[PDB]
């Protein structure tokens, strides 16, 4: 089978939104977690491989990334496309850098481009400085961000502290002027000596020029913006996701996450379908915690009714709050957590087809607790959420992160796909 | 001037909330934070002593207690109230057990007792076991606290694990009972050699047969509870918080909380009144900060409206999850605390009066720039957040933390509290 783009992504939510973006601009594609250990997948042009490599030490980033690479290389991938975040999530000491360079190595290629924006979420960048809505990274919430707040916007500066070459820009008029003039001033920087190229983008229709210039680079890095640019120089000659619509069969929904917009979502949906909320004191040990699966898996089971039982965890996560109201939210704990581990392994058993699921931590558990490995992306539901389709359990998943989604999100998941 | 009862209190929240149940149940107080440096307030019969002690190291906690202890001494204190928090806060380590037991040697006494319960906010305590609404201590949100995770429900081995001596229990039971029974059930616990004794209680009640039977205590130890307990001793033969009754002039919200109340809060109060929701690109520096403070303080001046000007940061607090929507909220930055900081000495200037502060550290941050010491504790706007009057400026404080109060909190602030 051909694989035209085989991307390796460093977090779970950014691989799901590239494969995403693949998907909605014509590119049937697999997402797989971790590094890969069986064969290309079936039925799709592009695969999109997973890793935690984000915030890890540098080493455990190259190791993964060339363990990719190398999977990626058997497939007879053609183009391979290292995603990182948005706003270049890093420090001084990796991973954009190290990884890249590795992969460079490992590809025989001297010259790569580095593009980060995606202007539908406000991700632009000019002159090789990076924008956050209408300000500087720098002066943006990224500033003080948890891992790796982000004190200086220039990308080159960026990626050479942390890298081991010099580092060039191509600006937006370049890009203005098209794809002759773009592909001249790439190749002069390149005889000039740098090794990376920063690549200016405010709006989609210079992602689509970068796309057009490097629809055979051999290796290209970024976010999601480029991909989308790259995929549809594919689509330009025709196209028609399918294969991660969604299956027939009884829905759940899991709700784990703690946060404003999980909360508005629980308390809409729980209006429309049987709800039942997840007693902490009854996941306090092994044995109580198996009994509660088993009961609250016979309770969406028996339930009949034409939207999707939901269990939420997020009147829980809200106790610590309750009771000293200094706090706010705390995550679901791993009691709860480990709950929706066997809740949903015994869901599946009993027939629940899809499992519409809200929280990073408990897409995870569900996602492992059911053995999914990886999926087919399908159609989006909202940005960066698509229906998926695991490859080897008949099992459809929606799996939202935090304070992604709308109000409704619950029921458009079920409403807006049926068949 | 007389002063009965002085509380020595762990937290700045509930220093604030004991001062208040005196206050609500007749005994006039005012509270100074850190260790006062002065002279007996004027008109009050109880003082209230904030220090920053639930967490940091045993020593600094038992020296601040101490130097605290000296002062109410030298006033002519009649009892003292060690307070902490109702759900036991503390590690092994300290600091409740530590401190009690340095009080009782200041104090020259060998029995206590510990009293947690506040019913009212779904604290009880049964046979010594402690209770957050339905659930033992440990089996509620209490078992994952941050700091100070709770896991064991039992507060005589929890105080003994922390403290030097034996500590026994009174039951409901006895309470139930009257005075006379629990008077002699204290004395036996201190003839078998006990230094400590956990009082029950289930409802106010109980506590008020507490207060009765320890009106005379040299120290007594507890949450909020006990004290409305002792205070009804004292309302029993005449009462009649008019001292914290908030001053004429113009009142002004300052937002700097996260949470999810605050930013109901802030969605509500902004239909009704000028807003300006504060610029983090106009506080990255010194010279900026000071600047966009001038700025914002004559905005708030200039305002004319019935209903007090609103400048809030908790848009600001909503940046990181607005670019990465798997985050939500991030607390206040350092660079608006600063602003707010600057904003508030300028505002007082100017002339305003009434500083209705939503958030923890901004409410910090607002006193220490009026250089506020301590205060007059005034009527509740909502629980645990009453109108409070400086000691030595002509300044009237309503300091709200995290997630207390209603929707309506900033309007409630002005409209039900006039002249």
């Given at each position: 089978?051909?694989?035209?783009?085989?991307?390796?992504?460093?977090?779970?939510?950014?691989?799901?939104?590239?494969?995403?973006?693949?998907?909605?601009?014509?590119?049937?594609?697999?997402?797989?977690?971790?590094?890969?250990?069986?064969?290309?997948?079936?039925?799709?042009?592009?695969?999109?491989?997973?890793?935690?490599?984000?915030?890890?030490?540098?080493?455990?980033?190259?190791?993964?990334?060339?363990?990719?690479?190398?999977?990626?290389?058997?497939?007879?991938?053609?183009?391979?496309?290292?995603?990182?975040?948005?706003?270049?999530?890093?420090?001084?000491?990796?991973?954009?850098?190290?990884?890249?360079?590795?992969?460079?190595?490992?590809?025989?290629?001297?010259?790569?481009?580095?593009?980060?924006?995606?202007?539908?979420?406000?991700?632009?960048?000019?002159?090789?400085?990076?924008?956050?809505?209408?300000?500087?990274?720098?002066?943006?919430?990224?500033?003080?961000?948890?891992?790796?707040?982000?004190?200086?916007?220039?990308?080159?500066?960026?990626?050479?502290?942390?890298?081991?070459?010099?580092?060039?820009?191509?600006?937006?008029?370049?890009?203005?002027?098209?794809?002759?003039?773009?592909?001249?001033?790439?190749?002069?920087?390149?005889?000039?000596?740098?090794?990376?190229?920063?690549?200016?983008?405010?709006?989609?229709?210079?992602?689509?020029?970068?796309?057009?210039?490097?629809?055979?680079?051999?290796?290209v890095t970024g976010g999601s913006g480029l991909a989308m640019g790259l995929a549809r120089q594919w689509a330009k000659h025709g196209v028609s996701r399918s294969a991660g619509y969604p299956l027939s069969g009884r829905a759940v929904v899991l709700s784990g996450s703690c946060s404003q917009m999980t909360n508005q979502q629980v308390a809409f949906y729980r209006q429309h379908a049987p709800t039942r909320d997840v007693d902490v004191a009854r996941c306090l040990s092994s044995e109580t915690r198996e009994a509660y699966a088993e009961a609250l898996a016979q309770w969406v089971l028996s339930q009949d009714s034409e939207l999707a039982p939901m269990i939420s965890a997020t009147a829980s996560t809200q106790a610590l709050a309750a009771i000293q109201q200094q706090y706010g939210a705390t995550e679901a704990s791993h009691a709860v957590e480990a709950l929706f581990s066997l809740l949903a392994a015994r869901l599946a058993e009993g027939g629940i087809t899809r499992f519409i699921v809200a929280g990073g931590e408990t897409s995870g558990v569900v996602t492992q607790s059911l053995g999914i490995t990886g999926f087919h992306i399908g159609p989006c539901i909202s940005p960066g959420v698509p229906w998926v389709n695991a490859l080897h359990a008949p099992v459809s998943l929606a799996l939202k992160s935090g304070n992604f989604g709308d109000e409704s999100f619950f029921i458009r998941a079920q409403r807006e796909f049926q068949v």
């Open positions: 089978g051909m694989l035209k783009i085989g991307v390796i992504a460093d977090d779970f939510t950014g691989a799901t939104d590239i494969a995403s973006f693949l998907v909605e601009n014509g590119m049937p594609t697999v997402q797989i977690n971790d590094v890969p250990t069986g064969t290309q997948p079936e039925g799709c042009d592009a695969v999109v491989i997973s890793l935690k490599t984000r915030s890890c030490p540098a080493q455990e980033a190259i190791k993964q990334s060339l363990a990719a690479l190398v999977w990626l290389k058997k497939q007879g991938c053609q183009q391979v496309y290292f995603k990182y975040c948005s706003t270049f999530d890093s420090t001084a000491e990796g991973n954009i850098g190290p990884v890249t360079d590795a992969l460079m190595v490992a590809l025989d290629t001297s010259f790569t481009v580095i593009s980060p924006a995606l202007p539908v979420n406000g991700r632009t960048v000019y002159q090789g400085y990076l924008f956050v809505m209408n300000h500087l990274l720098a002066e943006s919430g990224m500033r003080h961000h948890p891992i790796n707040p982000m004190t200086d916007s220039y990308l080159p500066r960026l990626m050479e502290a942390q890298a081991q070459g010099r580092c060039g820009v191509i600006p937006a008029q370049t890009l203005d002027e098209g794809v002759a003039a773009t592909r001249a001033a790439l190749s002069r920087l390149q005889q000039e000596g740098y090794r990376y190229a920063v690549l200016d983008a405010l709006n989609e229709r210079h992602l689509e020029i970068q796309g057009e210039v490097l629809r055979d680079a051999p290796l």
